[PDB]
Amino acid sequence: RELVFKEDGQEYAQVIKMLGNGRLEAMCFDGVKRLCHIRGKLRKKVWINTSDIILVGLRDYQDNKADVILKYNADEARSLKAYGELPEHAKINETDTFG
Amino acid sequence: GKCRGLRTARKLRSHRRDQKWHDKQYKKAHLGTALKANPFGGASHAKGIVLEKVGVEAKQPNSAIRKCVRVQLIKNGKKITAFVPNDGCLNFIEENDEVLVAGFGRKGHAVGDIPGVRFKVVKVANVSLLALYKGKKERPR
Amino acid sequence: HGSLARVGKVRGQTLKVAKQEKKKKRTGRAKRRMQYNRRFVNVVPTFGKKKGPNANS
Amino acid sequence: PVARSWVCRKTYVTPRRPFEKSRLDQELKLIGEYGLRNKREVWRVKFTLAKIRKAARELLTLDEKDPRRLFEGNALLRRLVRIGVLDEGKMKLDYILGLKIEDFLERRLQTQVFKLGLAKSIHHARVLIRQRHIRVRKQVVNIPSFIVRLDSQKHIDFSLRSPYGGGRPGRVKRKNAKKGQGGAG
Amino acid sequence: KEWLPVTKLGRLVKDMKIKSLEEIYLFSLPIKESEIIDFFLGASLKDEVLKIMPVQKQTRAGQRTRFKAFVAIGDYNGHVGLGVKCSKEVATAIRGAIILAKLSIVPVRRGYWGNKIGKPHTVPCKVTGRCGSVLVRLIPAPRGTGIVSAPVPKKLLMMAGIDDCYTSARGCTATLGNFAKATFDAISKTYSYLTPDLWKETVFTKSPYQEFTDHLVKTHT
RNA sequence: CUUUAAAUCCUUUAACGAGGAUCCAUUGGAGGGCAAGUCUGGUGCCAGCAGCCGCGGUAAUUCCAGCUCCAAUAGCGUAUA
């Protein structure tokens, strides 16, 4: 509904391996692998898929854990990409809902 | 009882001793394995150096994470995992600092929704966490 | 916002009010005397459910 | 090897239930009516009454015409009639068990000063005793928990070194008198 | 607000021919009007609610909850009773439990511990009552001991007039209804026990139904 | 002054020594177990509380602060045999 951007302690990541036990692996836009955690509103109200644009929170004393906040589906994700936040090597690969 | 003879005392004593050893609390309280596996070594409190901070998660009923530190003791060399109790008291602790850990409430048992943690932090840098949390004393600079 | 699991967030963003300067409270024998008086000789015969000491319904 | 005693004991027993209702009600009633300070005093009186009752019970489980029973039972009975909680018409071993906490708390020095007729209230009686105003047989008492005897009840009066029983006045009388002398001079 | 007795016992009590419920207990007649006892025992019959326990029944459209009330009744110098009633509402269940408790009260007897001086204060012997898995034992105590019990049998023993008792319970005492019914059956057994205080040959006096039948045939059909 | 090898401590005793008698009593709680607010403001499954049931999802009786109340009282709470 609204375009909210990243802040201090938050960034964007791409889901690489979709696991169980309410956690997943996401590749952050800084160049490090992290074990993210599914938020309490993100278990069943929304469904997180692979290769999607998500909001990932930083951890200030350990640097191998994270947690996920939001999810951008198609148009706000491509509008955020048009603004410029990521290295251009990463590929969207047309992330949206299929038919 | 079953033996009701006038000269039946050795059998009753041996049966009571065998059924006493065949128990739970007497079994942990009389072997050396249950006290040897204890990282405190039969002690109420222990000291050690904090290496790192870990955010351990809660159980399935409730959704939060628990701020925790990992302690390597000096009396035996074992590595334990102790919870920082109050709100915002993790910021009073940094790496390579000594703390005084204690039990967490149920005598070597995970209490509440925190899995795999049986200890808590009482004092940090030779001053209590309650005095720092209530704003009575200050960390020595 | 900042981060989700910030250490000491709520106590850090809590509003700060000050204590109110009040009269001191009696302690010792006179505290028990006041409690006995207020609980046993200032009571009126009532019916139903007895009201609590802190009832503010 | 030092020459000490190392002999001491507790004078009270805490109750089993920490948060009850009716027990706290009669404890508060006893404290407010007898002007006590805390629950430790009424628990102490309850403990010594329980010890006396326990001794009376274990002597009452015994048989008659036993000389040690007759001896220390008569010792207990003469102690209980000389302390003021028993009468001569009830000099029997079973009548010890019919005693109450009111009988032990009525021989306290505070309520004896209050009922003797020289104190306004029982808290005023405790203040009067604590500030060294009375004496019991040519000897002042600084404490309210002085359990009097039957033969020493008629000797309680004001102390000689007190402004109430005739003596030197206190400090606010002398200070106000000196202020009046300064204002008049 | 008037008394219209449907039984000849209630009419006979209302006609001032029965002095007290002593002979009613002696002849072991069932009491089916709860206000006969309320006439005999009036303002000296206090009560309070032990526990309101909700029970539910599963249907197609959810659960139909119902409230069950436990109340203790009795004068502090003798008789004591207990009643159980369940209904839809709380107040209706409580008033039905009050009527059912006052309908069925039993007399208790008191004895001595050793010497027979003064008034009786304790349970005369060792009685036991059992219902469900709960066992309640009543043991005599010396004078001035008090009631050493759980709070529910303690309040039942104080409302029954017994001043001194030692107790020992076994079973699932967390269920209040079974515990209360067990101590009620324990204290109700004080007259079914035979003691050598009463071994003389009793005389069978005439029943009120035989004694006042000429009054009854005139007062009712 | 007494005590004491000589002192100190206690007791005795003259001169001073309290009105909000500022000469100012704390420790744990307030859903049940278990005595005691369906109070107010803030965060909003976050922070955290919770020995056990469980409490927090943008109207919290349980979190964080103020008021009020409750248990013991120069004492109270916590961890281990």
Curated annotation (Swiss-Prot), chain A:
User: Molecular function terms in GO for this entry?
Assistant: RNA binding; translation factor activity, RNA binding; translation initiation factor activity; tRNA binding
- Gene Ontology cellular component annotations, sorted alphabetically: cytoplasm; cytosol; eukaryotic 43S preinitiation complex; eukaryotic 48S preinitiation complex; multi-eIF complex; synapse
Q: Which domain of life is it from?
A: Eukaryota
Biological-process GO terms, alphabetical: ribosome assembly; translational initiation
| Keyword set includes RNA-binding | yes
Q: Which UniProt keywords apply?
A: Cytoplasm, Host-virus interaction, Initiation factor, Protein biosynthesis, RNA-binding, tRNA-binding
Location relative to the cell? Cytoplasm
Principal localization reads: cytoplasm
Q: Where is the S1-like domain?
A: 1-73
Give the transmembrane ranges: none
- Complexes and interactors: Component of the 43S pre-initiation complex (43S PIC), which is composed of the 40S ribosomal subunit, EIF1, eIF1A (EIF1AX), eIF3 complex, EIF5 and eIF2-GTP-initiator tRNA complex (eIF2 ternary complex). Interacts with EIF5; this interaction contributes to the maintenance of EIF1 within the open 43S PIC. Interacts through its C-terminal domain (CTD) with the CTD of EIF5B; from the location of the start codon by the 43S complex until the formation of the 80S complex. (Microbial infection) Interacts with human respiratory syncytial virus (HRSV) nucleoprotein; this interaction recruits EIF1AX to the viral replication complex to facilitate viral genomic RNA synthesis and virus production.
Return the similarity comment: Belongs to the eIF-1A family.
**Name of the molecule in the record:** Eukaryotic translation initiation factor 1A, X-chromosomal
Curated annotation (Swiss-Prot), chain B:
Query: Residue ranges of region Disordered?
Result: 1-25
Which residues does this entry mark as bearing N6-acetyllysine? Answer: K134
Cross-link annotation Glycyl lysine isopeptide (Lys-Gly) (interchain with G-Cter in SUMO2), location: K36
Give residues where N6-succinyllysine occurs: K53
What SUPFAM superfamilies does UniProt report for this protein, alphabetically?
A: Nucleic acid-binding proteins (SSF50249)
- Annotated keywords: Acetylation, Cytoplasm, Endoplasmic reticulum, Hydroxylation, Isopeptide bond, Nucleus, Ribonucleoprotein, Ribosomal protein, Ubl conjugation
- Give any GO molecular function from the UniProt entry: structural constituent of ribosome
Question: What GO terms fall under cellular component here?
Answer: cytosolic ribosome; nucleolus; rough endoplasmic reticulum; small ribosomal subunit
Got any disulfides in this one, which pairs? none
Q: How is it modified after translation?
A: Hydroxylation at Pro-61 affects translation termination efficiency.
Skewed-composition ranges (Basic residues): 1-19
Job of this protein: Component of the ribosome, a large ribonucleoprotein complex responsible for the synthesis of proteins in the cell. The small ribosomal subunit (SSU) binds messenger RNAs (mRNAs) and translates the encoded message by selecting cognate aminoacyl-transfer RNA (tRNA) molecules. The large subunit (LSU) contains the ribosomal catalytic site termed the peptidyl transferase center (PTC), which catalyzes the formation of peptide bonds, thereby polymerizing the amino acids delivered by tRNAs into a polypeptide chain.
PANTHER family linked to this entry: 30S RIBOSOMAL PROTEIN S12 FAMILY MEMBER (PTHR11652)
Q: Which family does it belong to?
A: Belongs to the universal ribosomal protein uS12 family.
Could you tell me which NCBIfam families the record lists for this protein?
PRK04211.1, uS12_E_A
Q: How does it assemble?
A: Component of the 40S small ribosomal subunit. Part of the small subunit (SSU) processome, composed of more than 70 proteins and the RNA chaperone small nucleolar RNA (snoRNA) U3.
What name appears for this protein in its UniProt entry?
Small ribosomal subunit protein uS12
Swiss-Prot record, chain C:
Q: Which residues carry this modification: N6-succinyllysine?
A: K49
Q: Write down what this protein is called.
A: Small ribosomal subunit protein eS30
The entry's function note states: Component of the 40S subunit of the ribosome. Contributes to the assembly and function of 40S ribosomal subunits.
Provide the taxonomic classification.
Eukaryota, Metazoa, Chordata, Craniata, Vertebrata
Which cysteines bridge via disulfide bonds? none
Q: Where in the cell is it found?
A: Cytoplasm; Nucleus
Species the sequence originates in: Oryctolagus cuniculus (Rabbit)
Q: How does it assemble?
A: Component of the 40S subunit of the ribosome.
Swiss-Prot record, chain D:
Residues of the S4 RNA-binding domain:
107-181
Q: Where in the cell is it found?
A: Cytoplasm; Nucleus, Nucleolus
* N6-acetyllysine modification, residue list: K65, K115, K154
The superkingdom listed in its UniProt entry is Eukaryota
Q: Name one GO cellular component term.
A: nucleolus
Going by the UniProt record, its keywords in alphabetical order are: Acetylation, Cytoplasm, Isopeptide bond, Nucleus, Phosphoprotein, Ribonucleoprotein, Ribosomal protein, RNA-binding, rRNA-binding, Ubl conjugation
Q: Which family does it belong to?
A: Belongs to the universal ribosomal protein uS4 family.
Per the entry, what this protein does is:
Component of the small ribosomal subunit. The ribosome is a large ribonucleoprotein complex responsible for the synthesis of proteins in the cell. Part of the small subunit (SSU) processome, first precursor of the small eukaryotic ribosomal subunit. During the assembly of the SSU processome in the nucleolus, many ribosome biogenesis factors, an RNA chaperone and ribosomal proteins associate with the nascent pre-rRNA and work in concert to generate RNA folding, modifications, rearrangements and cleavage as well as targeted degradation of pre-ribosomal RNA by the RNA exosome.
Q: What is the protein's name according to its record?
A: Small ribosomal subunit protein uS4
Q: What is the lineage of its organism?
A: Eukaryota, Metazoa, Chordata, Craniata, Vertebrata
The gene is RPS9
